[PDB]
Amino acid sequence: SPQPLEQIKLSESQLSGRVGMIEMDLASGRTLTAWRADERFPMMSTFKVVLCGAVLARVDAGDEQLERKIHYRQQDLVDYSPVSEKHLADGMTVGELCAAAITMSDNSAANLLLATVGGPAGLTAFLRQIGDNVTRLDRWETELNEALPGDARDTTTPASMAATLRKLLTSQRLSARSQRQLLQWMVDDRVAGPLIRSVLPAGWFIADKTGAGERGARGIVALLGPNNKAERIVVIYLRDTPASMAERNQQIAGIGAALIEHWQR
Numbered sequence: 001s002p003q004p005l006e007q008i009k010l011s012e013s014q015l016s017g018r019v020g021m022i023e024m025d026l027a028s029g030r031t032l033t034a035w036r037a038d039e040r041f042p043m044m045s046t047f048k049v050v051l052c053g054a055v056l057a058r059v060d061a062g063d064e065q066l067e068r069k070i071h072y073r074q075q076d077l078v079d080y081s082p083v084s085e086k087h088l089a090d091g092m093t094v095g096e097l098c099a100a101a102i103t104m105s106d107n108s109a110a111n112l113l114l115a116t117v118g119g120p121a122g123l124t125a126f127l128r129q130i131g132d133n134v135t136r137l138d139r140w141e142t143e144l145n146e147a148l149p150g151d152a153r154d155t156t157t158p159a160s161m162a163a164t165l166r167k168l169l170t171s172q173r174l175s176a177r178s179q180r181q182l183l184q185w186m187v188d189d190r191v192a193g194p195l196i197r198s199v200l201p202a203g204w205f206i207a208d209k210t211g212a213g214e215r216g217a218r219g220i221v222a223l224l225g226p227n228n229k230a231e232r233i234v235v236i237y238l239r240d241t242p243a244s245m246a247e248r249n250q251q252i253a254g255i256g257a258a259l260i261e262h263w264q265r
């Protein structure tokens with residue numbers, strides 16, 4: 001593979017789209033690679049990690065319990081509810097809803113959670129309270145994936161998302177148990193996680209949340225590192241490309257390959 005930055009450029013060229021990328025040391029926040037890191041990209045399903053960070057903050061404050069069972073109706077369901085559609089009779093705990101949102105990309109679980117934190121406005125208010133002055137949620141699942149060109153709704157920037165993930169996972173804004181829980185939900189992704197392991201060299205740690213959207217939008221927020229350690233946060237977003245899903249996936253994999261072969265920067 002080429003150097004990370006050269007590979008990122010090759011991905012824009014091949015996709016005819018914008019790539020946004022940051023690579024950041026998880027422990028310290030050192031930025032290693034930044035490309036279009038202050039430009040806006042739709043978060044898509046990546047927003048669910050932030051969502052659950054706001055949930056956990058409420059649990060830490062005594063305002064929520066991960067045990068609390070939420071009951072909902074079939075009319076509450078939106079497109080793609082692989083776990084939540086199975087619990088119309090018995091409900092799901094808040095903790096279970098976060099597992100379903102992060103690990104299975106369950107959209108009704110995400111909207112149920114979003115209601116608990118005050119909706120898109122409430123989650124944006126939470127972001128402002130942790131010092132993220134850029135990322136915004138405006139809409140609910142699945143409209144938030146619309147990715148209209150030039151539309152600021154439901155966007156983050158790579159730099160802002162990396163800083164916010166770092167804050168949620170490590171800054172002691174969340175309690176120790178909550179930081180640990182957020183991490184474990186990312187480790188437990190049921191879809192992209194296992195496939196990524198299957199192509200990662202031995203000894204590479206992965207935790208992640210992926211997302212997709214219209215007009216080629218695609219992204220991943222991940223923790224990655226050798227020696228079975230979550231050394232770096234890697235955030236990669238794509239937008240405004242007509243390419244197939246397989247090609248957007250291959251390009252993202254390509255950027256990862258470049259990071260792996262050129263790790264010690």
Ligand SMILES: OC[C@H]1O[C@H](O[C@H]2[C@H](O)[C@@H](O)[C@H](OCCCCCCC3CCCCC3)O[C@@H]2CO)[C@H](O)[C@@H](O)[C@@H]1O
Nearest residue numbers: 001196199200201220222224234252253256257260261
């Ligand atoms: O010299 C380093 C490594 O080079 C190759 O590994 C390849 C691997 O065989 C391939 O499957 C992967 O694809 C990259 C797959 C990454 C998939 C997604 C990565 C995630 C991580 C977070 C950000 C982007 C998405 O690249 C590496 C590096 O060339 C050799 O196979 C391996 O034995 C060797 O240890």
Ligand SMILES: *C(=O)c1cc2ccccn2c1N[C@@H](C(=O)O)[C@](C)(COC(=O)NCCN)S(=O)O
Nearest residue numbers: 044045046104105145191192210211212213245
């Ligand atoms: C966010 O998680 C998300 C947003 C959208 C939008 C449209 C389609 C799918 N998604 C997802 N989820 C997928 C993703 O890649 O993030 C998903 C985890 C896996 O997607 C697929 O492999 N196939 C669906 C076709 N796009 S989820 O299980 O569908």
